[PDB]
Amino acid sequence: SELQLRVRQLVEQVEQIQKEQNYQRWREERFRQTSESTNQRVLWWSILQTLILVAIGVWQMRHLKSFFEAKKLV
Amino acid sequence: SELQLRVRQLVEQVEQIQKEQNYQRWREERFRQTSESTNQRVLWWSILQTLILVAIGVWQMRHLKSFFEAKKLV
Amino acid sequence: SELQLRVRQLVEQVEQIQKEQNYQRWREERFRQTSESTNQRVLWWSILQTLILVAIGVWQMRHLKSFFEAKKLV
Amino acid sequence: SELQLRVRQLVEQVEQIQKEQNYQRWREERFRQTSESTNQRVLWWSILQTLILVAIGVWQMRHLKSFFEAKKLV
Amino acid sequence: SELQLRVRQLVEQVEQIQKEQNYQRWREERFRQTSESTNQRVLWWSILQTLILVAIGVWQMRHLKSFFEAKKLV
Amino acid sequence: SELQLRVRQLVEQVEQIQKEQNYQRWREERFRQTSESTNQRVLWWSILQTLILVAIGVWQMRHLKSFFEAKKLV
Amino acid sequence: EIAAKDKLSELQLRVRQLVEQVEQIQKEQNYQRWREERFRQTSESTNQRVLWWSILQTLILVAIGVWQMRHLKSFFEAKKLV
Amino acid sequence: EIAAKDKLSELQLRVRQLVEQVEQIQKEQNYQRWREERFRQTSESTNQRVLWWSILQTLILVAIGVWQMRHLKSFFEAKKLV
Amino acid sequence: KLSELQLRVRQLVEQVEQIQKEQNYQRWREERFRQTSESTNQRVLWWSILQTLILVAIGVWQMRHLKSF
Amino acid sequence: RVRQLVEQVEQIQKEQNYQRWREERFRQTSESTNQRVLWWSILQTLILVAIGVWQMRHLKSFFEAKK
Amino acid sequence: SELQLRVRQLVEQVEQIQKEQNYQRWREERFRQTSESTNQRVLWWSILQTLILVAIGVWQMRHLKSFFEAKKLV
Amino acid sequence: EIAAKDKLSELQLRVRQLVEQVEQIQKEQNYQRWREERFRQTSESTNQRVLWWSILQTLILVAIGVWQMRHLKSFFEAKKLV
């Protein structure tokens, strides 16, 4: 029944294979949701940076103006 | 007979495992290429934005200097 | 014996599925670590960034304060 | 020899089990990584919330003073 | 026979470890989804709060400008 | 002979699997309890901080009103 | 002495009683704890329920801030009017 | 006789110590239970609070609306005065 | 005989679990009672807080009425 | 005899379960019923509050009457 | 004879035990229902939030109208 | 006498068995503690080349800001003498 034994072993391999298919699916999901997160991520941080830059510019401008006015009064 | 059906089943398992290997190699390629692309992409954008930040910082410095020189000639 | 040959084939197939399963695991783990790291790094940088910008704003105000004092004292 | 065959099967299973032990480690790792993320994340989220309150209060007091002066001087 | 009962014990053990691996895989999928959802939601709230404060600051600046316009007309 | 060695191997594998079952169930309850605790803690902190934001926002609403009344009685 | 030994015997009986008292405590530790896990389930449900509603109300607070601004406007459009 | 019996007494003393020590262990077990109970109590309290704590959360919008309505009413009154 | 005795032992185990079932029930009821009571007091306490907020607004427009006088 | 006794214990266990069924029912009622009172109960609370405001209004009216 | 009768009783005993087990399973189902009863209680809280408040609002409106009448008298 | 003492010893052994049960409970607590301990948040100190550059860059930006400020101050001084 050697052949049969071999067949049994093959079926054991089969179950394991199903499990690995599932694992692959999980990996795919990870890439998917992680790819979505990193896409949102990077972009949003960049946006923030832009905003901050704008803000600094504004700040500078404002204070310059203020000082000018101060000396205009002086 | 039944052993013939089991031989067909094992051939089916071999085919599915070959598909598993193809998808495994391809998906490794996806992770590796995507990870390298993401790292290079974030490096490019973020270093570019750092140089941009310093560039407009110096540009605002120069514009404060120019406005103050204009004030000197009032 | 044809049957025997097929048994051998099956064994080889099993082997292929097995060592590679280990490989897959490694890929995942390794891969995951990398991913994690990347994410973390990004996040860290962002936080360092924003907060730092806030501080910068505060110090701009501080510069006005010393400068303002100079304008008064003079 | 049947017994021996069974034993061989058992060893294959233990190897799988080997990978299963690795999976347990994986679980652990995952969990802890998540924990870390929440920790640092909740930490600087609370920190940023404190900055939210401080920034709002300080700047509202600032325009309090500015609008006070504006209505006084008109 | 002792060999047959060893075989039955081995089969029971392999079934048990297969159920165990199923449980670990499903639990990893579920809790990975939960963890990434929670982390994404919290960081999304953090970036939203940053935008909330930027919007509030600008809108109250517009508010003060509206007072300036009103006083300029009275 | 070798068969009793195989019996010892199977027994130690069963012992290791029982240890893995204990660790798996224990770590499962760590995930469950930790997830519930994290959700409860973030809910607590979030509700506390939103109540803080609204309450102190109203508080300097009242303080702005009080300062305006004080200016009226100048 | 003899009397003391008798007392010791009485004490032994008391320790038997003590042993009985332990077991009960162990029982308390089991099933009760499982029901504590059910209480935790309830808590979890509640958490799920508030992992968004609170945010809506935060947005609500932003709106409140704007309401405050409006009220302030009213207040300052009053002092000028005297 | 004598000395041997003294040794026996020593053994008895050891037993007494075990009874004492054991009792202390039991006390410790009790401590590890009361704390747990407290935690459970807290959880139940929390549930109630959530509904009612939750009620306070749901009192933060409606109330605001009501205030606004009152303001409107005041405005109407002003119109009546003018 | 022996087998039967073992079965009896199993029954005893079931009765221990049976006791546990009773315990579930009682736990539930107890919990419920306590919970309800405390809960009641709490949402009423908060009604009072809300009342204060509303009451203060009433005071704010009594003032308006005074201005109208 | 012994077997009869075993049967009896089994029966007892079943009975315990049924006692618990009743308990469960009670619990359900408690959960709903009392909470419904939190219904009725808070209606009463609202009423109390309302009364308070009415009283306040009356006071205001008195002040109006005293100019 | 008698002994045999006792054996029969024992089998009946076993049947009863089985029934007890069934009952236990049904009680577990009841527990599931109990777990979902909490959600029904939350629905009751939602109803409390959405009808009594409405009533209050209506009430307010009506009595505000009464105040208007009073104002007309005054 | 002797025999009675032997019986007492047996009782003590039973008590010790109860103590062992308590020890098992303690072990469970220890297992809970094992499901913890270890380290905390990981600290960056590797790869230095890229990560280091990033941090460095941030710092540089800050420094640049400061430099600008200094320059501005200098300008102010110049015109203060003007």
Residue numbers in the entry:
A (entry chain H), B (entry chain I), C (entry chain G), D (entry chain E), E (entry chain D), F (entry chain F), ...: 162 to 235
G (entry chain B), H (entry chain A), L (entry chain C): 154 to 235
I (entry chain J): 160 to 228
J (entry chain K): 167 to 233
Extract from the study:
TMED9 is a member of the TMED family of cargo receptors that facilitate the bidirectional transport of membrane proteins at the endoplasmic reticulum (ER)–Golgi interface via anterograde COPII and retrograde COPI vesicles. In addition, all TMEDs share a conserved domain architecture with luminal Golgi-dynamics (GOLD) and coiled-coil (CC) domains and a single TM domain. Sorting signals for COPI (dilysine motif, KK) and COPII (diphenylalanine motif, FF) coatomer proteins are contained in the cytosolic tail of TMED9. Here, we report cryo–electron microscopy (cryo-EM) structures of full-length TMED9 in octameric and dodecameric forms.
An unexpected feature of the TMED9 oligomers is an intrinsic symmetry mismatch between the CC and TM domains. In the homo-dodecamer, the TM domain was formed by three tetramers, but the CC domain was formed by four trimers. In contrast to the symmetry of the TM domain, the CC domain formed obligate trimeric coiled coils, as was also predicted by MultiCoil. The experiment identified a number of PIPs, with PIP (36:2) containing two oleic acyl chains as the most prominent PIP species. PIP (36:2) fits well with the cryo-EM density at both the headgroup and the acyl chains. The location of the PIP molecules suggests that they may facilitate TM oligomerization. The PIP headgroup between the TM tetramers is within hydrogen bonding distance to the R223 and H224 side chains from two of the four subunits at the tetramer-tetramer interface; these interactions could further stabilize octameric, dodecameric, or higher-order TMED9 complexes. In addition, several hydrogen bonds may bridge the CC trimers to stabilize the oligomeric assemblies, such as those from E163, Q165, E173, Q177, K180, E181, N183, R186, R191, Q194, T195, Q201, R202, and W205. We have detected previously undescribed oligomeric forms of TMED9, including octameric, and dodecameric structures. These and, by extension, additional higher-order self-oligomerizing TMED9 structures, are stabilized by intrinsic symmetry mismatch between the TM and CC domains. Thus, not only can TMED9 oligomers recruit COPI but they may also exhibit enhanced interaction with COPI through increased avidity.
